[PDB]
Structure 1
Amino acid sequence: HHMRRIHFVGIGGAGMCGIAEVLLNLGYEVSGSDLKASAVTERLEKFGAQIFIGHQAENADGADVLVVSSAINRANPEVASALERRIPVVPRAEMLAELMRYRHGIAVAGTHGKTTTTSLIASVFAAGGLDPTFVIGGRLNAAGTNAQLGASRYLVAEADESDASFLHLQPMVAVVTNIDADDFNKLKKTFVEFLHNLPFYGLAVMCVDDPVVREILPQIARPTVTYGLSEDADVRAINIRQEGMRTWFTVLRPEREPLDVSVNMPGLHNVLNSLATIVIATDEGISDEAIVQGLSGFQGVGR
C-alpha cells in the first residue's frame, strides 16, 4: 500500500471536506491546509484530520498524495514541495472518482435525469436501510439514519461525461438514462467506453426508450438490464396514470409479479427516473415495500 497519508490543499473548501471525511472513515491518515480555521476544519480534526492553517512547504511533509481543488498551482509552497519530490498531486475530481474503488459504486450517467435518479436511488436505498453516500454536484451526502460520510457500503454518484474523471470511474453498476446530441460519434464512443469500465460481473442499466442508448446497446459486452415504456424493455412501466403531483404505474420485472408503485413527482420523465431506480433497487435485493416507500415518499432533489 503506497498511500498512507493524504494531504488536502484547502481542506475546508467545497467538495474537499467531504472527500477528506470519507478517506478518514476508510482508515487513511489525512492532513490538510486552509487559509482560515472554520467549523468545517474543527469538525475534520475531531474525525482525525491534522489541520494546518496557512500554506507552507512543511505542511506537505510525510504525505504520499496531495489533493488540490482543481488546477495544479506550483506557486503554492505545499504543491511545489510535492512536485519537487514526485509526490502525486491530483485534483479533487479524480480523488472523488477514486472513492468508488473502495465501495459498491453506482454511477448515474446520461444527459438528462442524473440528479433526480441519483436522488431517487438514495431515497429507495434509505427506505431499505442501506443508507448510501451519494454525490450530487461534486458534494458528498449521507442518506438514511447513518450520518458518517463514506461509512456505507454503497456510493451513488452522478457521472458527467464532460468531466475529465468520467472514464476513470470504477463502478459496480452504471446507468445511462439517455444520450443527447445537444463530434457525436466521439460522444457515443465515450459512453461505450464508460460502460466497459464495469467488471464482467457488474451491471449496465440502459434506457431503451432513448434512441441513442438503444443504438449503442448491442456494443455493450457487459450484463445489461434495459428499462423503459418500450414493449421490449426488461423492466417496463405500464398502466401509467398521471394524477396531479403524483404518477401511478405498474412495473414489470423479470421473474417477478407486476408491482404497482407511485412517484410523488409529475411527468413521464419521472416514471423513467423511477424505472432506473427500480432496476437498481431490485438488483440489490430491496423489498417491494421499500421501493414503494422510497418512490412515493420522495420529497424532491435537495429536500
Structure 2
Amino acid sequence: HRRIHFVGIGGAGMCGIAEVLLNLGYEVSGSDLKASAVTERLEKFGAQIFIGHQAENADGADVLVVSSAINRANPEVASALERRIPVVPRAEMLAELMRYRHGIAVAGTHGKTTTTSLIASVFAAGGLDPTFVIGGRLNAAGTNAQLGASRYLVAEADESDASFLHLQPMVAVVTNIDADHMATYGGDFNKLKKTFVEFLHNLPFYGLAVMCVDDPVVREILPQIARPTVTYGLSEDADVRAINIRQEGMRTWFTVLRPEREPLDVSVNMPGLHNVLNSLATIVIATDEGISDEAIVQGLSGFQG
C-alpha cells in the first residue's frame, strides 16, 4: 500500500488523476495554493489536501506527481529528491492508469480526439459509463461515480508524448501516421514509423490492433504487427468497410460491412470521410467488445462534435 502526493493537485490535468487513484484504493495527498471546489471534491472522496507548498506536505509520500507548472525549487519537490522519493511527471502517472483497467488506446496522428469521444459515446450507450482521456483530462460523460469506476479506460495515445511507449492497452487503434511530430524522432519519418510498430507490440498476444488501411503508411507497417488485427477503411480489402456514403442534412449516413455480420446502417452528425473512418474504428472496437448494434447506432448518431 502506497501514498501518492500531487504538487498542484487542483490543476485541471492533476485532479482527475488523483480521483482515479482514490478510486483504485491508494492514499492520495496533494498540495495547492488555492482551495477550490475541485480540492473539496477530492477531500470529500478521501484525499488529504494541503494549502501552500512546504516540504512537510511531501512527508510520508511514496511517490510525487508534479505538473509542468512546478519548479525544481519547489520545497516539496526538493524534499522528495533529497529523501529519494521518486518524482513522476503528470503525463506518466496518467498513462499508468491503463494498467489497472481494460485500456483502449486511440493512437494516430489525427482523429484521436474524435475517435475517443465516439468510442466513449457508444460504450455509454451500452451502459458502460467509461472513463476517457482527451487532451490530458479525464472525463466520464454524466457519470454519477468517481473517475475510474468503469472497467474501461479510453485514451488518446500521442506519439509525441514521452509515455507513448509505456501505455499497456488491451486494444490499440491507429487512425493514421503523419509527419507532424517527426521532431520528436530526430526529424526522421522512418523512425516515427518504427515507433508505431513498437507501440502496437506493447499489446499482449490476446489484444487487438485496429488499423486504418486507407493510410498508405499504416498499410505499409501492417505485415510487421505480430498481434491480432482488424483493418478498416473504404478500401475494398479492409475487414470493416463503409459503403453507400450519402447525406441527408449535416448528417452523414453510411452502411458498415463486418465479417460474418449483416450490413448495419449508421449515421454520424459530422462531415468528411475522415469522420467516417473514425466511426469505423469505433464500430470495430464496439463490435469486438460485444456491444449491441442498437447501442452502436445510438452512440454514433447522438454524438454532436
Superposed pair shares fold, TM > 0.5? yes
Deviation at 1:284, TM superposition (A): 0.5
For residue 110 of structure 1, the aligned residue among 87, 108, 111 is 108
Q: Is the 8 Å Cα contact of residues 129 and 144 (structure 1) preserved in structure 2?
A: no
Residue deviations 1:187-239 (CA, integer Å, cap 9, x gap):
00111111111111111000000010000100111110000011110111111
Measure the CA separation in 1 of the matches of 2:144 and 2:217: 38
Q: Give the total of aligned pairs.
A: 296
Residues 195 and 72 of structure 1: CA distance in aligned 2, closer, same or farther (over 3 Å): farther
Measure the CA separation in 1 of the matches of 2:246 and 2:142: 29
Q: Is the 8 Å Cα contact of residues 108 and 176 (structure 2) preserved in structure 1?
A: yes
Deviation at 1:143, TM superposition (A): 2.5
Deviation at 1:70, TM superposition (A): 2.6
Q: Is the 8 Å Cα contact of residues 249 and 260 (structure 1) preserved in structure 2?
A: yes
Deviation at 1:72, TM superposition (A): 7.1
What are structure 1's unaligned runs of at least 5 residues? none
Residue deviations 1:94-137 (CA, integer Å, cap 9, x gap):
00000000011111111111111000001000000011100001
Measure the CA separation in 2 of the matches of 1:108 and 1:225: 14
Deviation at 1:74, TM superposition (A): 3.1
Measure the CA separation in 1 of the matches of 2:300 and 2:161: 29
Deviation at 1:181, TM superposition (A): 2.4
Measure the CA separation in 2 of the matches of 1:292 and 1:264: 12
Measure the CA separation in 2 of the matches of 1:39 and 1:115: 27
What are structure 2's unaligned runs of at least 5 residues? 181-187
Deviation at 1:244, TM superposition (A): 2.8
Q: Is the 8 Å Cα contact of residues 165 and 199 (structure 2) preserved in structure 1?
A: yes
Deviation at 1:145, TM superposition (A): 4.4
Q: TM-score, normalised by structure 1?
A: 0.95
Moved segments of 4+, more than 4 Å: none
Measure the CA separation in 2 of the matches of 1:145 and 1:157: 17
**76-85 vs 66-75, greater mean Cα deviation:** 66-75
Residue deviations 1:147-176 (CA, integer Å, cap 9, x gap):
421111100011110011111111110000
Structure 1 residue 200 and structure 2 residue 236: aligned? Answer: no
Deviation at 1:243, TM superposition (A): 2.9
Measure the CA separation in 2 of the matches of 1:83 and 1:241: 59
3-state SS of paired residue (2:12):
coil
Measure the CA separation in 1 of the matches of 2:3 and 2:238: 47
Q: Is the 8 Å Cα contact of residues 254 and 267 (structure 2) preserved in structure 1?
A: yes
3-state SS of paired residue (1:108):
strand
Deviation at 1:144, TM superposition (A): 4.9
Deviation at 1:285, TM superposition (A): 0.3
For residue 78 of structure 1, the aligned residue among 73, 76, 79 is 76
Measure the CA separation in 2 of the matches of 1:250 and 1:184: 35
Q: Is the 8 Å Cα contact of residues 130 and 144 (structure 1) preserved in structure 2?
A: no
Measure the CA separation in 2 of the matches of 1:81 and 1:146: 37
**231-240 vs 71-80, greater mean Cα deviation:** 71-80
Deviation at 1:38, TM superposition (A): 1.0
**257-266 vs 277-286, greater mean Cα deviation:** 257-266
Measure the CA separation in 1 of the matches of 2:147 and 2:175: 27
Measure the CA separation in 1 of the matches of 2:81 and 2:10: 22
Q: Is the 8 Å Cα contact of residues 7 and 70 (structure 2) preserved in structure 1?
A: no
For residue 54 of structure 2, the aligned residue among 47, 56, 72 is 56
Q: Is the 8 Å Cα contact of residues 70 and 93 (structure 1) preserved in structure 2?
A: no
**222-231 vs 233-242, greater mean Cα deviation:** 233-242
Measure the CA separation in 2 of the matches of 1:112 and 1:155: 20
Q: Is the 8 Å Cα contact of residues 250 and 259 (structure 1) preserved in structure 2?
A: yes
Deviation at 1:82, TM superposition (A): 1.0
Residues 157 and 203 of structure 1: CA distance in aligned 2, closer, same or farther (over 3 Å): same
Q: Is the 8 Å Cα contact of residues 72 and 91 (structure 1) preserved in structure 2?
A: no
Q: TM-score, normalised by structure 2?
A: 0.95
3-state SS of paired residue (2:246):
strand
